[PDB]
Each structure stands twice: as C-alpha cells, then as structure tokens.
Amino acid sequence: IPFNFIRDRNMVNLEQMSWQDAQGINYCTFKSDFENRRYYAFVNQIEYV
Amino acid sequence: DRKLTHFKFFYNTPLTDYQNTIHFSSNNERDNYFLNENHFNAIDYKNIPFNFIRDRNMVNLEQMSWQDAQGINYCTFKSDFENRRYYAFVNQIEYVNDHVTRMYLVIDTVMTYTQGNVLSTVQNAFVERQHLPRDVYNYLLPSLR
Amino acid sequence: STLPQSKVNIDVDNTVLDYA
Amino acid sequence: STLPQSKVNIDVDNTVLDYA
Amino acid sequence: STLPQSKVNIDVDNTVLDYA
Amino acid sequence: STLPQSKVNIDVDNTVLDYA
Amino acid sequence: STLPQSKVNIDVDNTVLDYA
Amino acid sequence: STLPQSKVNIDVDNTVLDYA
Amino acid sequence: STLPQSKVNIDVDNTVLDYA
Amino acid sequence: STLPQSKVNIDVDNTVLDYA
Amino acid sequence: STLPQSKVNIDVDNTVLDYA
Amino acid sequence: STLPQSKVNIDVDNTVLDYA
Amino acid sequence: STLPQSKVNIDVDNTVLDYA
Amino acid sequence: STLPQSKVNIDVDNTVLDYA
Amino acid sequence: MRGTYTIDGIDPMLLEQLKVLLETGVRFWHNDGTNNPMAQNVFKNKFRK
Amino acid sequence: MRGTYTIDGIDPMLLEQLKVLLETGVRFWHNDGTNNPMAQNVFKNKFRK
C-alpha cells in the first residue's frame, strides 16, 4: 500500500494500523519518489481520529 | 512600465552562518566571483524574470522541483527597483504545488553592504578585537604583550 | 469525513463510508 | 483536495478522486 | 490555485491550470 | 492581484493578467 | 456526533443515535 | 444540550431532556 | 439561560423563567 | 440586558427592565 | 448606549438620548 | 461617530454631527 | 475616511473627498 | 486601493487610479 | 562540533537542527548485528574500528 | 539622571521615554557647524562652553 505524503508536512495518516497496534511505534523509515534520499524519523505523537 | 527582478540561486555554498563571510576587494570583484565564475553549482534564471519586492522575503520559483530545491543556501537577486544588488540566505524551503516551491529569504547584510573599505568610514565608534596593520601593531606591541 | 492518505479510490456518486 | 499533485478533477464527467 | 511570480500570462476566459 | 505595480486590469475588455 | 466509531446514523429511517 | 458518554439511547423524534 | 438546573422552559405555554 | 442571579421572576410577555 | 444608568430610551416616542 | 461623555443631547431625527 | 477632521462628506451632492 | 495622506483630490464619480 | 559547515543536498532547516544537536554532543554506537546495538559492553571498546 | 521631573508641555508617554533614556545615560554633542558634529576630536574638549 503506497502513500501520498510530503516531507514538509510531518503529519501522516495510516490505513490499517489500529489503536492497539499503534501503541509502541517509535521509528518510521520512509522513501518518497519526490526525493531520492530516503528518510527516517521519530513518531513523536500518536492520535486517534 | 513594470519593474522585474532577476535571481540566481546556488547549491551547497559554504556560507551558512552570519559570523563568517567571504569579503571581497570591491563590489565588481564580488559580482564577478559570484556571477561570471563557475564556482559552486547554480540555477540561473536569466531568461525568466520575476516580480518580487525586497520587503516581502517570500519568493516563488517556477521551474525548481522539490529534488532540485534541496541543497539551496544562497540566493543573489538584483531588482530594477533598487540599483544595489542583494544577497540572502534561503532560510526555509516549502512545497505548495507541483509547479511552484516557495522559499523564504533573509538579507545577508554583511556581504551586501560591507564590501570594500566602507567600514573604515565609521567615526568615533568603540572597536574591539580588530586585526591591526603593521605600523600600529609594532607601535602597540607592548600593550598587547 | 476524514480520509487517509492511502490512495483510497473514492466515487462521489455512490461511495458510502462507515467510519466518521 | 488538500494535496492534488497533477490529477486535478476539473472535468465534470469524472466523479472519483483517488488518494484524497 | 496558487500562482508563481514568473510573469505567467493568464487568460481568465480559457486558461486551465494542471497544478493545484 | 497581490502586487500589481502599474498594469491594473481595470478595463473590462482585457481578460488576461500577467505575472500574478 | 463527536465520536462515532462504526455506528454512523447515515440511514434516514433510524432516528435514535446511541452513546452520543 | 450536553450529553454524557454513557450510551444514553436518544431518539430524535420524541426524546425530551430535563437537564440543560 | 446560562445555568438552568432542572426548570427548563421547554413548554410553549410558560413565558416566565425564574432566576436567569 | 444583564440579569442578576437572585431568582428574579421574569415574564417574557410583559416584563420591562429599567436598568441596562 | 454603552452606559445607560436609568434613562433607557425604550419608548418609541422619545428620539433623543442624553449623555451617550 | 464617536461621542464624548459630556451629556450631549442627541436627537436621532435631526441631529447632524460635524466631527467624525 | 480614516481621519476626517471637519470636512465630512455627509451631503449627497458632493462626490469628492480631499486628503483621504 | 490605498491612498496617501497628501490631500489627493478624489472624485468618486470619475476618478480612476493607476496604482493598486 | 561547533562551526560553519554544510552537508551536500540537505534541507537548510534540517541542517540547522543537525548543527545544534552536534553542538550539544551526539554519541554514535557502531552496529554489532544485534537487536539493540546501542547497548554493549563499553569496556571492550578498542582503538581500531 | 534618575528622579521625578516633568518638562512643561510634554506628552506623558514621551516624558516616560525621555526619563528612561536619561536613566540609561545620554551623551550630548555640541554643534560645530559641520556635516557630522557627532564626530569630533574628543581630546580638544575644553572646560568653558
């Protein structure tokens, strides 16, 4: 499942990750066709919508 | 009629802080170094002019994609509004559309205004930590010792 | 109402969403 | 939508917008 | 919607813009 | 537009505004 | 309502919404 | 007006609430 | 009113609201 | 306009208030 | 007005409000 | 428009004020 | 206008306001 | 739109301003 | 580190964050092919990489 | 200076600004009929005005 996302906006939305699965996530590695260099980040905050 | 301004952005320039700058003998020499010479990689917008005002730092570029945007530090722009040309740091890069990528600027005063012996014209100003010429350095040597 | 960024094909005419 | 890169649903006939 | 400052000749009657 | 210096499209006939 | 998880009262016939 | 989060079955047609 | 505890003037006939 | 919290019996139909 | 103490111009006939 | 707090008798029907 | 001292263009006939 | 504070005689009926 | 430097192809804001973080001081743990390379017997540290 | 004083016919806020500025300390350069009277040979300063 690919995603439509931009590095400039830190907000991200995930489809199939339930609240229980959400707890415990720290690190996210993402690679976008926009920029050749891949990126890594900390998941500072988790919110339920 | 309507005044337009020309930009020329650079890549991975060593200048990234206010404290350190590349002083030049005179404005012509600095322009020659930044414009005529091929130092650094640069994106030149000579063909495509821009409508921009120094007062608003925001700038929008047409043909610079997101990948090309990464790495830009220095922007030198000259507007028909003001004879003096200007230089600035690209503090922040933002993406708004597939066709435009906004960049903010902060005017680099040191490079723009302090070139040459202009600073020597200051009168009756407190000074500190100034590099000394040979005559005074020999004259003042005991004080430093 | 809110939509995730996961290329969810949405058809205005007939699409019905279970979640808020 | 919030971030349409090139696939803008200007045309009236199309009624589905993907990834938005 | 957003427009760059690059003297992009825009005609209100017929102009169609691909990007948002 | 946001910054029209002298070329203001007041006239009704003109339908294109450059650099805006 | 503010937090409807799955029981969204889209249908016209239903007139009662629980826990909201 | 305000509602508690205690699964209070509310019927739009006839429900009448004593408290504000 | 701002703080009606139990005496809410829902009924149309009543036209006086006390302590508000 | 403003009302004190002193159980001032107010009748919508005929009540007239001297103070603002 | 902003500060009418007791002389509120409720009546329709009066058309002048003093000190306001 | 603005009025001073000096008991300036104002008549809505005919009063005309020179100052803004 | 923002700062009219005494020359307020109340009258309908006048159509020009100076220094504003 | 914006006007300078230089006693620029403006006539509402016919005045046309070149600058924004 | 504390100085004027710029890594090629870096977003300026990320460069600023990296600059400040290095000025604070960052410790690097070399990978050991383990679940938690960050935790190791420090005393075993040797000169050559 | 630092004290309670009021110059005649002065806007109170301008008076406050002047008070604070004087408390910081202000230097007066007498006019010499030059383009920049502020810059002069200080050593030549003499007692009588």
From TrEMBL, chain B:
Q: Which domain of life is it from?
A: Viruses
Lineage of source species = Viruses, Duplodnaviria, Heunggongvirae, Uroviricota, Caudoviricetes
Please state which portion of the whole protein this structure contains, as first and last residue out of the total length. 3 to 147 of 588
Name of the featured protein: Major tail protein
Residue ranges of domain Tail knob protein gp9 N-terminal in the record: 3-116
What is the native source organism of this protein? Staphylococcus phage Andhra
From TrEMBL, chains C, D, E, F, G, H, I, J, K, L, M, N:
What top-level branch of life does the organism fall under?
Viruses
State the name under which the record lists this protein: Lower collar protein
Q: Which organism is it from?
A: Staphylococcus phage Andhra
